[PDB]
């Protein structure tokens, strides 16, 4: 958070890209850095490779480059996951009375619906698109801070 696309492209993505390349049976890698401070690196493998082995190899390679990353990135942490292409359904959850906002609905879905919808047989993964989760936000007034 709070980073510029060139800064995240140079300081963050370069060590990870320099360390990750070298595993067996790759085709290419892609990295995307966005203005809000998000970095996404996707790596594809040749057809026939078991996803579990590829995920294990990628985890082993990314675990080595952690100490070279900045303190903020390490404190937040990076996450890796195998991609599931196929879709079977999408479902929306609504608030017709306009009594609840976006964040509350997203966190309500996270709290109890996703856990029950992740344990069925055959489900690969479920996503969530909307606002973020809950947090204690403090907004500062620089004038009052400088006054004291």
């Amino acid at each position: 958070p709070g980073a510029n696309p060139k800064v995240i492209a140079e300081t963050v993505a370069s060590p990870l890209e320099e360390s990750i390349n070298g595993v067996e049976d790759m085709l290419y890698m892609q990295s995307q850095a966005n203005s809000d401070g998000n970095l996404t690196i996707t790596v594809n493998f040749k057809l026939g490779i078991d996803p579990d082995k590829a995920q294990q190899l990628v985890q082993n390679r990314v675990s080595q480059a952690m100490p070279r990353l900045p303190e903020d990135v390490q404190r937040l942490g990076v996450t890796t996951l195998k991609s599931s292409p196929t879709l079977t359904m999408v479902v929306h959850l609504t608030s017709p009375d306009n009594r609840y906002d976006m964040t509350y609905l997203r966190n309500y879905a996270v709290l109890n619906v996703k856990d029950r919808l992740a344990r069925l047989q055959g489900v690969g993964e479920v996503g969530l698109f909307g606002s973020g989760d809950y947090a204690m936000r403090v907004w500062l007034d620089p004038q009052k801070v400088a006054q004291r």
């Binding site: 060139k6 492209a9 085709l27 290419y28 892609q30 990295s31 966005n34 947090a135 007034d141």
Partner: protein
């Protein structure tokens, strides 16, 4: 704009529902503040039995209605035949700098490539997404009073940017505590000049830093470790796709300066890697049958 577009679209006889994502971009399914996507889902197959209720007619009518917005660029596309697969009619490639020249050089190379392609036959229209026209602010600090660079950077980092401090426990789970400046106090480019710092005395940044307006990109795409730009295209009508790659390579052999290379990315890369190696199966089957 997306709300108005959805309101306009939810009156068509053939449509059923519209889902909108104000703030999502189609280039890599990332987040952008100046882009939006709307999925429009139609009625069941039984109701739309008329000829004018087909998908193409709906798309044409929707585009005609959208062409009167005078506020944004609006386009309508059909679904892809297979999810997760790239375009199967055209082709795409990457122009990337091995020597790490810069952004302006890459943009000039892309423009020269587009000019050469439009000046040559056996190629149709070409598209790209490389943009360097996004405005932004640049702040410079001179070394001219007891103030430290670390403090003058930490104040800007914590006020304008977000800082993640500690955690807390609620609803049984763990969440984060973040600090940031108030919304009205950081909505103007001149608000950066009104912050204050220590040394013990209070001193504003009006006598320390200067701010100017510059231009740059918004998203950075890196391919195989080097900065790259995407080029889309397709064979011109009347010719096959085999000669298109040869023509592209021939023109790239001259229009590309030193330190710039091009590479196939999707589908075409796999077709080249596999090669023409499955042409023996028909003779083998004929011989076996005989």
């Amino acid at each position: 704009v997306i709300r108005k577009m959805s309101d306009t679209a939810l009156k068509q006889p053939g449509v059923e529902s519209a889902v909108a994502f104000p703030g999502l971009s189609i280039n890599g399914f990332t987040n952008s503040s100046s882009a939006g996507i709307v999925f429009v889902t139609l009625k069941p197959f039984d109701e739309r039995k008329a000829k004018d209720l087909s998908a193409n007619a709906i798309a044409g009518a929707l585009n005609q209605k959208y062409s009167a917005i005078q506020d944004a660029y609006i386009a309508v596309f059909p679904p892809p035949p297979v999810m997760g697969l790239g375009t199967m009619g055209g082709f795409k490639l990457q122009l990337e700098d091995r020597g790490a020249l810069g952004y302006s050089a890459l943009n000039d190379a892309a423009q020269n490539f587009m000019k050469a392609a439009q000046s040559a036959p056996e190629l149709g229209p070409m598209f790209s997404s490389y943009q360097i026209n996004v405005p932004q602010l640049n702040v410079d600090l001179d070394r001219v009073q007891g103030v430290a660079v670390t403090d003058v950077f930490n104040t800007m980092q914590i006020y304008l940017g977000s800082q993640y401090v500690n955690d807390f426990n609620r609803f049984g789970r763990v969440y984060q505590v973040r600090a940031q400046a108030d919304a009205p106090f950081r909505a103007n480019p001149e608000d950066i000049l009104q912050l204050k710092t220590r040394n013990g005395q209070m001193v504003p940044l009006s006598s320390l830093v200067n701010v100017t307006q510059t231009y740059g990109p918004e998203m950075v795409v890196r391919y195989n470790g080097y900065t790259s730009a995407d080029i889309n295209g397709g064979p011109a009508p009347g010719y096959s796709s085999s000669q298109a790659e040869a023509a592209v390579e021939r023109i790239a052999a001259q229009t590309l300066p030193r330190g710039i290379k091009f590479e196939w990315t999707d589908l075409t890369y796999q077709k080249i890697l596999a090669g023409n190696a499955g042409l023996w199966v028909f003779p083998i089957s004929v011989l076996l049958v005989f």
